[PDB]
Design an enzyme around this catalytic site. Structure first.
Site, PDB file in Angstrom:
ATOM      1  N   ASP A 180     -42.655  -5.546  51.746  1.00 39.45           N
ATOM      2  CA  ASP A 180     -43.614  -4.837  51.193  1.00 39.45           C
ATOM      3  C   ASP A 180     -44.972  -5.322  51.624  1.00 39.45           C
ATOM      4  O   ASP A 180     -45.191  -6.650  51.436  1.00 39.45           O
ATOM      5  CB  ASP A 180     -43.740  -4.788  49.832  1.00 39.45           C
ATOM      6  CG  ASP A 180     -43.770  -6.222  49.166  1.00 39.45           C
ATOM      7  OD1 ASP A 180     -42.599  -6.852  48.982  1.00 39.45           O
ATOM      8  OD2 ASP A 180     -44.544  -6.574  48.338  1.00 39.45           O
ATOM      9  N   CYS A 214     -40.816   4.632  50.990  1.00 40.83           N
ATOM     10  CA  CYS A 214     -40.655   3.001  50.799  1.00 40.83           C
ATOM     11  C   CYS A 214     -40.851   2.963  49.008  1.00 40.83           C
ATOM     12  O   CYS A 214     -40.277   4.100  48.511  1.00 40.83           O
ATOM     13  CB  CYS A 214     -41.656   2.287  51.277  1.00 40.83           C
ATOM     14  SG  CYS A 214     -43.333   3.240  51.605  1.00 40.83           S
ATOM     15  N   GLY A 217     -44.674   5.080  49.376  1.00 38.77           N
ATOM     16  CA  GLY A 217     -44.419   6.064  50.475  1.00 38.77           C
ATOM     17  C   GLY A 217     -45.595   6.502  51.312  1.00 38.77           C
ATOM     18  O   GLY A 217     -45.976   7.662  51.778  1.00 38.77           O
ATOM     19  N   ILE A 218     -46.373   5.348  51.529  1.00 36.69           N
ATOM     20  CA  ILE A 218     -47.582   5.468  52.292  1.00 36.69           C
ATOM     21  C   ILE A 218     -47.490   4.348  53.432  1.00 36.69           C
ATOM     22  O   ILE A 218     -48.105   4.331  54.441  1.00 36.69           O
ATOM     23  CB  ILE A 218     -48.700   5.484  51.625  1.00 36.69           C
ATOM     24  CG1 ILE A 218     -48.989   4.208  50.813  1.00 36.69           C
ATOM     25  CG2 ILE A 218     -48.718   6.898  50.667  1.00 36.69           C
ATOM     26  CD1 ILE A 218     -50.501   4.471  49.942  1.00 36.69           C
ATOM     27  N   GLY A 219     -47.405   3.026  52.770  1.00 36.81           N
ATOM     28  CA  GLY A 219     -47.466   1.779  53.695  1.00 36.81           C
ATOM     29  C   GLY A 219     -46.326   1.622  54.702  1.00 36.81           C
ATOM     30  O   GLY A 219     -46.657   2.044  55.730  1.00 36.81           O
ATOM     31  N   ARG A 220     -45.254   1.296  54.385  1.00 42.87           N
ATOM     32  CA  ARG A 220     -44.100   1.120  55.410  1.00 42.87           C
ATOM     33  C   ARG A 220     -43.657   2.576  56.075  1.00 42.87           C
ATOM     34  O   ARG A 220     -43.417   2.721  57.039  1.00 42.87           O
ATOM     35  CB  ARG A 220     -42.736   0.570  54.567  1.00 42.87           C
ATOM     36  CG  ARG A 220     -43.090  -1.059  54.550  1.00 42.87           C
ATOM     37  CD  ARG A 220     -42.189  -1.714  53.552  1.00 42.87           C
ATOM     38  NE  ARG A 220     -42.297  -1.341  52.316  1.00 42.87           N
ATOM     39  CZ  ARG A 220     -41.573  -1.875  51.344  1.00 42.87           C
ATOM     40  NH1 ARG A 220     -40.649  -2.671  51.396  1.00 42.87           N
ATOM     41  NH2 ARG A 220     -41.707  -1.522  49.899  1.00 42.87           N
ATOM     42  N   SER A 221     -43.545   3.563  55.052  1.00 46.29           N
ATOM     43  CA  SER A 221     -43.671   4.959  55.370  1.00 46.29           C
ATOM     44  C   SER A 221     -44.402   5.528  56.553  1.00 46.29           C
ATOM     45  O   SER A 221     -44.031   6.010  57.477  1.00 46.29           O
ATOM     46  CB  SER A 221     -43.503   5.767  54.220  1.00 46.29           C
ATOM     47  OG  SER A 221     -42.476   5.696  53.311  1.00 46.29           O
ATOM     48  N   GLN A 261     -50.912   0.589  55.211  1.00 44.43           N
ATOM     49  CA  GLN A 261     -51.428  -0.018  53.975  1.00 44.43           C
ATOM     50  C   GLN A 261     -52.190  -1.243  54.491  1.00 44.43           C
ATOM     51  O   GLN A 261     -53.206  -1.691  53.732  1.00 44.43           O
ATOM     52  CB  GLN A 261     -50.323  -0.355  52.853  1.00 44.43           C
ATOM     53  CG  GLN A 261     -51.104  -1.217  51.871  1.00 44.43           C
ATOM     54  CD  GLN A 261     -52.279  -0.462  50.963  1.00 44.43           C
ATOM     55  OE1 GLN A 261     -52.149   0.652  51.036  1.00 44.43           O
ATOM     56  NE2 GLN A 261     -53.087  -1.347  50.579  1.00 44.43           N
TER      57      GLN A 261
HETATM   58  C1  LIG Z   1     -54.156  -2.994  46.909  1.00 48.91           C
HETATM   59  N1  LIG Z   1     -53.464  -1.670  46.883  1.00 48.91           N
HETATM   60  C2  LIG Z   1     -54.261  -0.371  47.455  1.00 48.91           C
HETATM   61  O1  LIG Z   1     -55.334  -0.650  47.996  1.00 48.91           O
HETATM   62  N2  LIG Z   1     -53.591   0.870  47.178  1.00 48.91           N
HETATM   63  C3  LIG Z   1     -52.567   0.964  46.341  1.00 48.91           C
HETATM   64  C4  LIG Z   1     -52.324   1.441  45.153  1.00 48.91           C
HETATM   65  C5  LIG Z   1     -51.297   1.417  44.408  1.00 48.91           C
HETATM   66  C6  LIG Z   1     -50.250   1.068  44.844  1.00 48.91           C
HETATM   67  C7  LIG Z   1     -50.046   0.568  46.150  1.00 48.91           C
HETATM   68  C8  LIG Z   1     -48.794   0.210  46.914  1.00 48.91           C
HETATM   69  S1  LIG Z   1     -47.656  -0.755  45.760  1.00 48.91           S
HETATM   70  C9  LIG Z   1     -46.380  -0.859  47.170  1.00 48.91           C
HETATM   71  C10 LIG Z   1     -45.188  -1.713  46.798  1.00 48.91           C
HETATM   72  O2  LIG Z   1     -44.245  -1.361  47.703  1.00 48.91           O
HETATM   73  O3  LIG Z   1     -45.070  -2.289  45.681  1.00 48.91           O
HETATM   74  C11 LIG Z   1     -47.046  -0.354  48.129  1.00 48.91           C
HETATM   75  O4  LIG Z   1     -46.544  -0.381  49.491  1.00 48.91           O
HETATM   76  C12 LIG Z   1     -46.980  -1.299  50.507  1.00 48.91           C
HETATM   77  C13 LIG Z   1     -45.889  -1.216  51.652  1.00 48.91           C
HETATM   78  O5  LIG Z   1     -45.165  -0.181  51.454  1.00 48.91           O
HETATM   79  O6  LIG Z   1     -46.183  -1.905  52.713  1.00 48.91           O
HETATM   80  C14 LIG Z   1     -48.493   0.095  48.220  1.00 48.91           C
HETATM   81 BR1  LIG Z   1     -49.215   1.121  49.610  1.00 48.91          BR
HETATM   82  C15 LIG Z   1     -51.353   0.566  46.981  1.00 48.91           C
HETATM   83  C16 LIG Z   1     -54.333   2.179  47.861  1.00 48.91           C
HETATM   84  C17 LIG Z   1     -55.354   2.654  46.986  1.00 48.91           C
HETATM   85  C18 LIG Z   1     -55.092   4.333  47.017  1.00 48.91           C
HETATM   86  C19 LIG Z   1     -54.972   4.908  48.165  1.00 48.91           C
HETATM   87  C20 LIG Z   1     -53.933   4.199  48.963  1.00 48.91           C
HETATM   88  C21 LIG Z   1     -53.073   3.066  48.144  1.00 48.91           C
END
Ligand SMILES: CNC(=O)N(c1cccc(-c2sc(C(=O)O)c(OCC(=O)O)c2Br)c1)C1CCCCC1
Ligand SMILES: [Cl-]
Ligand SMILES: [Cl-]
Ligand SMILES: [Cl-]
Ligand SMILES: [Cl-]
Ligand SMILES: [Cl-]
Ligand SMILES: [Cl-]
Ligand SMILES: [Mg+2]
EC number: 3.1.3.48
Length: 297
Positions: A180, A214, A217-221, A261
């Site tokens: 992650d 994932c 559904g935005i980072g790895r996906s 991400q």
């Molecule tokens: C620091 N966070 C951040 O800037 N945000 C955000 C908000 C809520 C959840 C996540 C997560 S939690 C998570 C996991 O797997 O725990 C994951 O995945 C990571 C991966 O898949 O690498 C992601 Br993204 C990220 C953004 C603000 C709102 C707009 C986009 C997101």
């Protein structure tokens, strides 16, 4: 050209600035439906929602909401559905979506437990003899077989619409070693996995869009889809120099927020595409190289 741009960004070590630029320019559309009080428990993360215009609608009158977006890449002529890891109460909705959208493949880029927390419900059967029935959506799901490799697993699933007794095979591609907020171990291990998905036929235009998820559904996906789309674009034109990675990512972000991400995931996207370009342009040896370097055995 991606390779020249990559080396330029690396030399000046400005990946953070490049990535932040993308965040700055990214589209911003309303997510009103996702924010309705009745949908609070259908969302894994308060700050990750599907845009209204591109959200997947469930074919039911009660509540058509699921945290899932249709990424339709017009130029590339491929679509993906990016979605959060299903919750205990949305596993039925998840499989309803898969059925209604006629998806043949599901790509899972996370583990159920990561860093001590549950990033995703156990939404598929782990044992043949213990099938899952989703009463709310009237679907049955059976594990048919699995092919376990060192860092990923491929499962065959049978999805049944109990209402019509129609049956479909779903292929499940599970990447278990992609951290992650991190990147794959190497371009090779990633490309090896992507080509596994491709060679299954799950991405064919004759099926519904592949489902990619994932946890959020935005980072790895997002990373997975950007690489695949860029390779496809390049493939269609047979011209690696014609692909503008940042522009493709921005296009994708019109359909779901936050795709990719971290700056390093973006950097890794370049690596994957640059290396993958070798296969696209007729190198018949790299595919076996990746398989070896990935140590899937
Ligand atoms: C620091 N966070 C951040 O800037 N945000 C955000 C908000 C809520 C959840 C996540 C997560 S939690 C998570 C996991 O797997 O725990 C994951 O995945 C990571 C991966 O898949 O690498 C992601 Br993204 C990220 C953004 C603000 C709102 C707009 C986009 C997101
Ligand atoms: Cl629309
Ligand atoms: Cl078993
Ligand atoms: Cl067993
Ligand atoms: Cl067993
Ligand atoms: Cl057994
Ligand atoms: Cl068994
Ligand atoms: Mg058994």
């Amino acid at each position: 050209e991606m390779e020249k741009e990559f080396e330029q960004i690396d030399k000046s070590g400005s990946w953070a600035a490049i990535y932040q630029d993308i965040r700055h320019e990214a589209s911003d559309f309303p997510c009103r439906v996702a924010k309705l009080p009745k949908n609070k428990n259908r969302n894994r993360y308060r700050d990750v929602s599907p845009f209204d215009h591109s959200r997947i609608k469930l074919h039911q009158e009660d509540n058509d909401y699921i945290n899932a977006s249709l990424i339709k890449m017009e130029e590339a002529q491929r679509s993906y559905i990016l979605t959060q890891g299903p919750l205990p109460n949305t596993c039925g909705h998840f499989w309803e979506m898969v059925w209604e959208q006629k998806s043949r493949g599901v790509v899972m880029l996370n583990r159920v437990m990561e860093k001590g927390s549950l990033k995703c419900a156990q939404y598929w059967p782990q044992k043949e003899e213990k099938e899952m029935i989703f009463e709310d959506t009237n679907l049955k799901l059976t594990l048919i077989s699995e092919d376990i490799k060192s860092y990923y697993t491929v499962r065959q699933l049978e999805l049944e619409n109990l209402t019509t007794q129609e049956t479909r095979e779903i292929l499940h591609f599970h990447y278990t070693t992609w951290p992650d907020f991190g990147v794959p171990e190497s371009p090779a291990s990633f490309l090896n996995f992507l080509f596994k998905v491709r060679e299954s036929g799950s991405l064919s235009p004759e099926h519904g869009p592949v489902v990619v998820h994932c946890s959020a559904g935005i980072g790895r996906s997002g990373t997975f889809c950007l690489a695949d789309t860029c390779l496809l674009l390049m493939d269609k034109r047979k011209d690696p120099s014609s692909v503008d990675i940042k522009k493709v990512l921005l296009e994708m972000r019109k359909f779901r927020m936050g795709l990719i991400q971290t700056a390093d995931q973006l950097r890794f996207s370049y690596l994957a595409v640059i290396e993958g370009a070798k296969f696209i342009m007729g190198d018949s040896s790299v595919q076996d190289q990746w398989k070896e370097l990935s140590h899937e055995d």
